[PDB]
């Protein structure tokens, strides 16, 4: 798996982006190749190994 | 809502003005009574009072013994509080120089009519029983007012010492050979059922077990032997429907390492006790085995 | 006599006053600072640095 | 703020007269099918899970998984309700018919309206009305659901007298401060069918137990470490006069049964339990400490 | 013949719960009793026929 | 004595590679027993991995996860583990291993582990001739369906010659439920099912002499009468052949025989229930997260 954590930490100029058929469909269609979600707050962005 | 609202630790009701000092805060008026530190505003024990006749105040003395309530056909009592060291002379697990000895001490009138009311009913004895807790800060007089512990450490007001459970040697038995670094404390009541008459059998039994299922496995262990009366009653009594082989029910649990034996002092009379030291209440009900 | 031929084994114990013995900066211990965690149970509050 | 609370709606605008009658209910157990925040009244209280053909088995089964909770505090247009923490005190009510006594185990059963009339109820508003499930003490409990499963066991047979003589008395409970006419699951002739999908399972056992068991107790014999399998055999006769030289000496076996259906005779034997469970056990909602005055609230800690 | 050996050498005869035996195996027990008095220290010695 | 600390620390001796920290990140919140309970245990009392044997026993994983002291992972920093126990009756996060929908509502039970379609077991932790098994955290309906099917395995064999009782556990070991497939790894007939199988067979024999004869005659009288799709498939169950009134009418007396026919069905009943721990409430869509209250 490519490793993700990193991105919720390293800050980003940011991007107004837009798409079709809202986040949710077009990440369940896995037309994007590496994907990930949750819906809690797991604190793994919070540790650092 | 604002961010420091949630940036806040979880208040601490120590550093807060108690609700009695606040609303004379207000008034700037000194009362007579001491508000500036309310008692027992810090325990986790939860208790009741029960008033008590006086013939049945003994042994209880002693800080730490077992109120179960016993029902009752008559309208009145229709609770009689029954100490468990008074349901030694029922019992069939007790010495015969044991039974005899505090038996002496339940000379009472008032003690009296317990006896006679286990014998005359048809009910088996654990479904007439319940219990309630332990003995604190006992009030005595011809009607005393005890403050039974409901699920909690016994201990003195003022956290100023820590009240043992005791519990009789003669009911007291320990499966393992190690104890482990924690250990539960179930109340048993079993039945060896024959003919003439079901005596009962008390065990308190302390124990690492947890799980009910293993609890129960090793109780069928030396229990057995009444494992084969209560089946050999079964073909021997039609129509006659003996029930329930035995009953444990969970009372708290120990540190284990506390415990160690030792002897109440009440009316000259000795009596050896096996002497539970930091024991929280944690009540469990009857459950049925066979 | 038996046709056998016993032999058995027999495990001892010496009590030995061992000597260790290592170089100057052989290894390197690093610490933190030690944190002191607090527990409560109404009749005694022990903590566990 | 420190005190979490389940929020209500109403609907309906209440009359400023039908507001005090939730006030005379401050202290009464108000159990939640399931735990939310935001709650309407329709969602609230067990008047949702009514029936009609379905007995009194389908409302306290799905009473077991709702989630109890204590009222709090009317207020205007809004309903308090906290779910009580395990092991910590709380003042309840004594809905029930029965008045409580100290220390008593208390458990949760669904009301059962009877033949007379007596108290009925106070909050219809709209069709739904705000019923509440009665808090019996544990010990009456037992006695109540050992009546209704036998009064079912009666229903294929209500055609002679005696039958509905003993029925009859089944019906009346005679407890402490208390007698009451348990209604009948009988209605209309034929039974309700939750209860006659619960009657089944009594009698599954009384019956699958009768001859499967008898393949089992003969290969375990030997051992004889307890030695009452010696006994036991001998306890599946199912008699009370001796035996009389009629030779049943020996229990009637399965005879050359499929491998495969032997099986399936097995494994239906413990579905059935799965149904039946659920009226086996109450867990003690509640135990309470002292009853105040005029058996109206009393102090109790939670259970469970 | 499976208690006559007992007392040809003294080894007393175990009786144990069927539950205690299945912890028995799980993990272990002391099941020989201490000496009265341990007038040397532990006992050792094995057997290869 | 300190009483058993709510805290626990677990530190592992072997030196940790970076594809197994990351396991651990994601195993946060997951149900991991242990033995010792000590504030500062090793990773070798660490799992239920220490107590695997050559016979592999599935029986015997279910006896000895009982006496487990089930805990939450929390806070996986460093090499560092914080194991908190959970007190009695409060709420806490938990977060599934083994792959099963969840309804929301339903009693949850620790389990011994099975195995999905993979059996590759992968994206678990192997750490030098080490492994983190950890048990599942299933439904209260799977726990009886993986349990009532293990105590007539040791029934049906007892009778079978051993060819039929291969058959038997070849078709016994599978489990479906809720759509996805299920199977117990290495069944084993054992001692420790023995000491089991006795009191449920004797279970099974003094509840057929509790039941009055009306009792089980009901359904008897009730296939002369009414028809059910319940009852059409009863009669496959039970031996075809071998109103008058009931012989005797005693309520007093049947009601006090039912009262020891529940004393029979919370325990022969109980046999197969395993002590249920977790009270789901809201399920996450992901299944990967619940809430969840009261132990065992």
Known sequence: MENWSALELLPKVGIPTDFLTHVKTSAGEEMFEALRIYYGDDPERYNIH | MDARAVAKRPRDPADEDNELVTALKAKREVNTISVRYLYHADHQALTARFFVPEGLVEFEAQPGALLIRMETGCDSPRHLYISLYLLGIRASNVSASTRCLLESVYTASAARAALQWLDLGPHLLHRRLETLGCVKTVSLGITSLLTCVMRGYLYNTLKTEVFALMIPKDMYLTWEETRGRLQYVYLIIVYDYDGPETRPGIYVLTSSIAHWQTLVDVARGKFARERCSFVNRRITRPRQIPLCTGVIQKLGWCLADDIHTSFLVHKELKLSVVRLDNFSVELGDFREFV | ?49 | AMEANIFCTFDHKLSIADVGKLTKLVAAVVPIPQRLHLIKHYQLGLHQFVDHTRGYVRLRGLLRNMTLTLMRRVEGNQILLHVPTHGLLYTVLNTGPVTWEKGDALCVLPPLFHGPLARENLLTLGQWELVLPWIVPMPLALEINQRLLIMGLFSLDRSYEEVKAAVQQLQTITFRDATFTIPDPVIDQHLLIDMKTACLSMSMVANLASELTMTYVRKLALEDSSMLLVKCQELLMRLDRERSVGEPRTPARPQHVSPDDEIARLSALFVMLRQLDDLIREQVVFTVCDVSPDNKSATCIFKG | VDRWIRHAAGVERPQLLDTETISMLTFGSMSERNAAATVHGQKAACELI
């Not at chain 3, 038996?2 to 290592?22: C, W």
């Not at chain 3, 052989?26 to 002191?36: K, L």
């Open chain 3, 1 to 49: 006599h038996p046709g056998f031929a016993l032999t058995a084994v027999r495990t001892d114990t010496f009590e030995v006053d061992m000597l260790l013995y290592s170089g100057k900066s052989c290894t390197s211990v690093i610490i933190n600072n030690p944190i002191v965690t607090k527990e409560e149970r109404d009749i005694s509050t022990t903590y566990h640095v």
